[PDB]
Structure formats: structure tokens, C-alpha cells
């Protein structure tokens, strides 16, 4: 169990900032929200849910040479890639995506699942 | 029947640059060289046999998307570039040239010969 004070909250329901509010986390779910366990303290930050984004492609990236790596590498090499990728794409904020191509983010997926 | 009349002629065979010079021209060969029928006159030019060139690929030429095109391209194009490639190669002086690979040359080989 673990109770986050947060200096503002918003709620995504509505749209507005509420006040200061404690979180109580217990299995890996949010328990009660209190306005107002270990104590991790962000009195002076703006706390939100985590962000979705429904439309990328984890297994590529743009590049100068996008265009000749069909016929030159191989799908390894695009997972050795989508690691970082996807911790780059963990670490802004984004906690969920929606993958819309690509034959590696499935295996991403499980690994990811896995631990 | 033609004679061609040349100021300077360069004897191969000795690397010695020699006087003016007739050769008379008849049925492709040459037939003879008088020192000293329709005329070409070159009385101000140097005359030397054709240049040979013993290594080159006409149905190629090098460019920064060329490492792309085993990919994209069909012979067709290949031939359709050794056209202009090949007329260049002749306007240059050299009327033969040994190709050292690429399995469009002996289709152009077979074109040239057939006029």
C-alpha cells in the first residue's frame, strides 16, 4: 500500500483541477481518492491519469534510409530498436498505446506483459 | 571508296607521330596508306586509330541511389539507360570496349551489331 499526496488533481470526468488530494494504491489499483503506507510527496506538482496514445508504430522509426532496410534487415534488429523505443515512449508520460501496424509489437506486447 | 586525307598521323605500331597521310577506306577496311572516290579532308587534325577501353559496365553507372535499385528496377531501364551510355562511350573516341560484367551487355552487343 502506498498513499500519494498530490498538491492538485485533475479529473479527467470533468475537466477541472481540483485541490489537494491522497491517493491510496493497494494491488496495483487506486483504493480511495481523499481530499487533502509509504508516502510518496508531490505536494508541489499537478497530478493527472496516465496519457493514451491510439496511433503509433512502435516496431519503426523515420529515417533517410527507411526506404532500403525492406530488403536489408531483419526483424531483430527492429526489436533491438523497439526496446528503446518503447521505454522513450514510457518515460513522456504515455502509460498505454494502440499499436496500428506492425508484426513485432505483438512479441513487444507479451515481452512487456512478461516483465 | 573513300579517302581520307590526314595531316598528322600516329603510327601505333612505333609511337612515333608521323607526316600527312591518304588511307583509302573500302568495304570497312582499310586498304592502303599513301604518304602525302569522295574526300575527308582533316589536313589540320591528328588522325589515330580508335581507342579501346578494357574495362567498363555500360548497363550501370554510379549515384548516390544506385546501391537501391537491385530492389526497384527491371533490365528494361538498365537498357534503356545503356542506350544513351553506350552512343556517349562511342562519341568519345572509343570504338571498342571489353565489358567485365552485367547480363544486359551481350542483348546490347547482339543491338549494336544488328544496327
Redesign the interface.
Given at each position: 500500500p502506498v498513499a500519494v499526496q498530490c498538491g492538485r488533481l485533475f479529473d479527467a470526468r470533468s475537466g477541472q483541477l481540483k485541490g489537494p488530494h491522497t491517493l491510496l494504491v493497494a494491488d496495483g489499483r487506486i483504493r480511495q481518492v481523499l481530499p487533502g503506507a509509504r508516502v510518496v510527496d508531490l505536494g508541489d506538482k499537478v497530478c493527472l491519469p496516465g496519457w493514451t496514445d491510439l496511433h503509433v508504430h512502435l516496431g519503426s522509426q523515420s529515417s533517410p534510409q527507411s526506404?532500403?532496410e525492406?530488403?536489408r534487415l531483419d526483424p531483430v534488429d527492429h526489436a533491438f530498436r523497439a526496446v528503446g523505443y518503447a521505454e522513450k515512449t514510457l518515460m513522456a508520460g504515455f502509460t498505454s498505446v494502440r499499436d496500428l501496424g506492425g508484426e513485432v509489437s505483438p512479441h513487444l506486447r507479451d515481452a512487456i506483459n512478461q516483465g
Open positions: 526506404y532500403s525492406d530488403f
